[PDB]
Amino acid sequence: SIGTGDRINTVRGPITISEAGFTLTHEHIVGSSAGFLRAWPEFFGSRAALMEKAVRGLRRARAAGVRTIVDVSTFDIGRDVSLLAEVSEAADVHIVAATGLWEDPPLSMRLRSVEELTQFFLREIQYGIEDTGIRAGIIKVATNGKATPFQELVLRAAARASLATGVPVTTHTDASQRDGEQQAAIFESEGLDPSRVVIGHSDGTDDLDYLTALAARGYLIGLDGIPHSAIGLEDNASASSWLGNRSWQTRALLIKALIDQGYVKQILVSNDWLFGFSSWVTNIMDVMDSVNPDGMAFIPLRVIPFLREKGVSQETLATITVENPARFLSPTLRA
Amino acid sequence: SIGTGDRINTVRGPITISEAGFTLTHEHIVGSSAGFLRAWPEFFGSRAALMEKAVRGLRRARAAGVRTIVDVSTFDIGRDVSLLAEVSEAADVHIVAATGLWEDPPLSMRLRSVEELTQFFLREIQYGIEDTGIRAGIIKVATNGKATPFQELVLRAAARASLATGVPVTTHTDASQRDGEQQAAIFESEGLDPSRVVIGHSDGTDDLDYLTALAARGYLIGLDGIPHSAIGLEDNASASSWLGNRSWQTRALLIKALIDQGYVKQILVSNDWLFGFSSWVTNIMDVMDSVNPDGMAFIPLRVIPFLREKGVSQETLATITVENPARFLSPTLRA
Ligand SMILES: CCOP(=O)(O)Cc1ccc(C)cc1
Ligand SMILES: CCOP(=O)(O)Cc1ccc(C)cc1
Ligand SMILES: [Zn+2]
Ligand SMILES: [Zn+2]
Ligand SMILES: [Zn+2]
Ligand SMILES: [Zn+2]
C-alpha cells in the first residue's frame, strides 16, 4: 500500500495488467473546473443526475466490451475522484484517475516552480488525491500551440513525476499546430522515454509527417476524439462546432494509416466523451448526446466494425484496444 | 431559516446588528484558488498549521477590539467555509463569508450568462455554500482596469443578487485606473443603489476627484489595504512589491481626507490581511508577517491611534469601525 510498484492504480485500488481488458485511454466522467461540482451541482441538474447518467453510459460501454476507462480529468478539469469511485463501482468498469494540469490552471498553480509542481503530481500518484487515498495512474498535461512558460514547467514536472514512479504521461495538443514536437523536446530534455508518453488529440490533424515524426521516436499516438471535433476556445461563433470539419470516418482512417506504417503497438484510441460538461457553452450535452447517442460505446460499436470492413484484423484491433493500454499503463521507465 | 430577512449571515449562523461590533470589512483567512487547500494542504505546511495560525491571528485581533471580520474570499479565491466556521468558533470572532467572483474564475464560470451567474450567487446567499448550509453575507466582484466582457456580467449578476436579497456588494479595483467609475455605471444600469456597494482597494490611489466622485453618488469607499500595497500580477520583478511605493500613513490619511469632506458614514477600513497565500509567490507570508507582525490587529493597534493623533475623535472612529459596517451589512435595498 506504499509504493507504485507494477500494478495499475484505479479509483477502487490496484489492478493487474490482465484485469484492465479493453481500455479507453482518453475519457471523462465530467469536464468541469476545480470545486465547481461541489459549489454548483444544480448546473448538472444535480450530482445524483450526473452520477446516474455516467453509470448508464458506462454500463452501455461495458455491454459493448469496455472494461476500463482512463479519466484524464486533472485538478483543473474538476476531477472528483469520489464521484469516479462511486460510478466505477456502480457500473463495474475500472476507472484510472489522472494527476497533472490541463489548460485552465488557477493562479495558485500557475505561480508554482517545476519542483513544487513535481511535488504536487507525486502527491497525487504516490500518496493520494485530496484526503481520499485514491492514487492517480496517469499524468495529464496540455498545450494549445506554443507552450506558455508555465506549461513548459508542467511538462517538465510531469516528466520528473514519471521518471520517479513509472506512471505515464498523456497530452492535450492543438494537433494542427504540431504541438507534440515541442512537447517531445521538453520531455526528452528531462530524460523521459517516449514509450511513457501518448501525444493526444492527434486525430485532430491529417499531417502524417507530424504523426510519423512522433511515432518514429517512440511516442504513442492518441487518436482519442474519433466521434467529435478537436474542440477549443474558438470564441466568436463556437458553440456547436462539435462534429467538426472532418468526419469520424476520416479520423478513424488515421488508425489504419498508422497500422499500415508499422505503428500498431503505438496507437491508442478513444472517444474523449463526457457525461457532464460545464467548461463549454450551456446545453452542449444535448448536442453531444443527439449526435453520438452511443457515447463511450462509439469506439467498440462503430469504429471497430468500420476498421474490420477496411481489412483490419481482430488480432490487430485487440493489440490496439487491450495490449497497448496494458503495456502503456503498467508502471515502468521503458515500455 | 429560509429567507435573508434583516440579521447578518455569518459562517456560524445569523447575528444581530448589535452583535457585529468592531468589524474589519475586507479580510481573508486564506488567499488561494478553488479546490487548492483540499488538493495540496502541504503547500501551507498542513491544513492544521494554517487553521492554528488563523486562530492565533484572529485571537490577537480580538484582543485589540475586533469582533467581526468579513472574509471577502470568493469561490475562485478558494474560500473554504468549513475552515472559516472552525476558525470563527475557535477564535470567538464572527466571520461573514462572501459569494461572487474575483479575478481568477475558471472556464466553468467564465462561460456562464448573467442569469446563470445570478442563480449561482443567489444559491450561496439564500440556500448555502456547497453542502454546508452556510450562507454568504456579501457579494465580491473584481476588475483590474476596463472590465472584461465576463466581468461586466459578474457586476450585473452581483447587482441582481443584491436587489433580490439586500446583501451588499464589495469590489476589487485597480484604483489607479479609476475602475470604480465603470463599476458604478454597470451597477446603476441594473438599478442597484450605491449605498449597497463598497468600492474596494480605494486606498490604492491619492486621486480625491475619483474618490469624491464615487462618494458623492452614495458609494462606500473601501480603504482596505492600509498596511500593504494594492498588489497585482506585475509579472517581471513583482515578488516583494508588498510594502508599496506609498507608506501606510499616506493610505491612512485618506481616511481623514474623506472625514474632512463629510463622508464619515461612507468610509470602511481594513487590512486586507491573510494567514495563507498561495495565489502569489512562494514564501510571501514570511515577508508579510515580518513587515506587519500585527496582522489584522494593524487597524486597531496602529491606524486608530495614528488618526487620534491627527485629531480624529473616538466618536468618529466608532462610526467608521462599528456603525458603518453594521449599516452596510444589514440586508436592505437602501442603507
Ligand atoms: C474536459 C477537457 O476536455 P478536452 O478533451 O481537452 C476537450 C476540451 C474541452 C473544453 C475546452 C475549453 C477545450 C477542449
Ligand atoms: C486573495 C485576494 O486578495 P486581494 O485582496 O485582491 C490581493 C491580491 C492577491 C493576489 C493577486 C494576484 C492580486 C491581488
Ligand atoms: Zn484535451
Ligand atoms: Zn479530454
Ligand atoms: Zn482584491
Ligand atoms: Zn482581498
Swiss-Prot record, chains A, B:
Compartment(s): Cell membrane
Cofactor dependence: Zn(2+)
Oxidoreductase listed as a keyword: no
Post-translational note: Predicted to be exported by the Tat system. The position of the signal peptide cleavage has been experimentally proven.
Membrane topology: Peripheral membrane protein
Keyword S-adenosyl-L-methionine: no
UniProt biotechnology annotation: Has attracted interest because of its potential use in the detoxification of chemical waste and warfare agents and its ability to degrade agricultural pesticides such as parathion.
GO molecular function, one term: aryldialkylphosphatase activity
EC identifiers of the protein: 3.1.8.1
Entries under PANTHER family matching the protein: PHOSPHOTRIESTERASE-RELATED, PHOSPHOTRIESTERASE-RELATED PROTEIN
Similarity remark: Belongs to the metallo-dependent hydrolases superfamily. Phosphotriesterase family.
Subunit and partners: Homodimer.
The name this protein goes by in its record: Parathion hydrolase
Organism: Brevundimonas diminuta
